[PDB]
Amino acid sequence: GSHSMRYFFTSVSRPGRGEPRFIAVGYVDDTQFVRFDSDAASQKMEPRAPWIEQEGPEYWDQETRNMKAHSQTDRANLGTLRGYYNQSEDGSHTIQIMYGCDVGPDGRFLRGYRQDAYDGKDYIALNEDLRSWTAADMAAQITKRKWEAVHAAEQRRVYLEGRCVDGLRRYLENGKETLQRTDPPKTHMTHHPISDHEATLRCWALGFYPAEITLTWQRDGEDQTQDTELVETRPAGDGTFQKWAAVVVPSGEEQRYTCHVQHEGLPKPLTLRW
Amino acid sequence: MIQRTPKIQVYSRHPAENGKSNFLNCYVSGFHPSDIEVDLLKNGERIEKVEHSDLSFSKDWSFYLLYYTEFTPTEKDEYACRVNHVTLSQPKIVKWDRDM
Amino acid sequence: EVDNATRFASVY
């Protein structure tokens, strides 16, 4: 299928405390493969998937140098934004950055992203044209003027269409055994009486990869929803994911209900009947 | 500056079978700021070997973290997740239900 | 492979 690489960066100022806390993670699809954590002993870019360990020491020295550099630039930007907004030095503030690229089944660039947030809200973002910026407020307009003057969009475009794609393509090859697999969901269905007259029917999807999935309860073929309790998709902790959908049904009619499961690891969607 | 309260799910990596080694997860998501306290509880006492994933975030910038510990469920032992965050007035405790 | 945060293009 198609594939994606994403890096997520969080800097949190802790005033009177140490330097800002900085955590960086990288993913290919829903698989984490690197991390950098300034509160960890390592002070280096560390592997989090096995297929990245075959990268040589020059890779780990470049990614580590770049992560430290990202940390430093965030530290400075924290002070800059504090000045733009006239916020006091005593409060803790957060910069978050996401960027990365998508390729299709042919390995060609399909989408690229770079977005920056301050205190949990959009700050500035590269547009899908990879040439212009959206500034979320008055302060980000200051940054937008600077980045227009310094040709930042072209530099980001070069990275997104270039080294981002090159690395993603390599990681997909070096980790094809895992990154390019799908694990289909294993579905359970469980019965939970609420009274003599009602019962919950819970449809489970377990051990599935990648995380995107759709669970629907249907009564006589008709997609319930409205009264279908759905929980957020959640990590099992082994690289697979879980989810369940629950529907309260009148006692006696459970056999009319069916659970519908759509997932990319399934050749056809499933309909399971109670 | 914003605040978002965490969502909490407490669950096991594998379907629970008493006497069989497993992992006890607490998944906290949708929260901001990133400062959060998450403890896993065994009959009300705090389990010490508890690790977490690296801080990451969703499309809306809200954070998520998985806290987990190796455990062996029994039919009588009670497990829970205790979560504190600036948006919670008191620590919130969600008991582990093997049925969710 | 991460991007570079060392140019004027990274400064707010």
Residue numbers in the entry:
A (entry chain A): 1 to 274
B (entry chain B): 0 to 99
C (entry chain M): 1 to 12
Lines from the paper:
MHC, also known as HLA in humans, plays a crucial role in orchestrating the immune system recognition and response to viral pathogens. Similar to HLA-A*0101, which is one of the earliest identified HLA alleles among the human population, HLA-A*2601 possesses a similar characteristic for the binding peptide and acts as a prevalent allomorph in HLA-I. In this study, we found that, compared with HLA-A*0101, HLA-A*2601 individuals exhibit distinctive features for the T cell responses to SARS-CoV-2 and influenza virus after infection and/or vaccination. Furthermore, we determined the crystal structures of the HLA-A*2601 complexed to four peptides derived from SARS-CoV-2 and human papillomavirus, with one structure of HLA-A*0101 for comparison. The overall structure of HLA-A*2601 displays the common characteristics of classic HLA-I molecules, with the extracellular region of the H chain folding into three domains.
We also determined one structure of HLA-A*0101 in comparison with HLA-A*2601 in detail. The P1 of HLA-A*2601 presented peptides prefer the negative-charged residues, whereas the P3 of HLA-A*0101-binding peptides prefer negative charges. For HLA-A*0101, although EVF was not a positive peptide to induce T cell responses in donors tested, when the P3 position changes from F to D, the results of in vitro refolding indicate an increase in the quantity of the HLA-A*0101/EVF complex. The results of CD revealed typical stability unfolding degradation curves akin to those observed for HLA-A*0101/EVF-3-D, HLA-A*2601/EVF, and HLA-A*2601/EVF-1-A (down panel), consistent with the in vitro refolding results. In contrast, for HLA-A*0101, Arg156 can form a salt bridge with P3-Asp or Glu of the peptides, and the Arg114 further enhances the positive charge of the pocket D. Meanwhile, the residue Gln62 of HLA-A*0101 cannot constitute the positive-charged pocket A, although Tyr7, Tyr159, and Tyr171 can still contribute to the anchoring of N terminus of the peptide. Compared with HLA-A*0101, the side chain of Ile97 in HLA-A*0101 is small, creating a deep pocket.
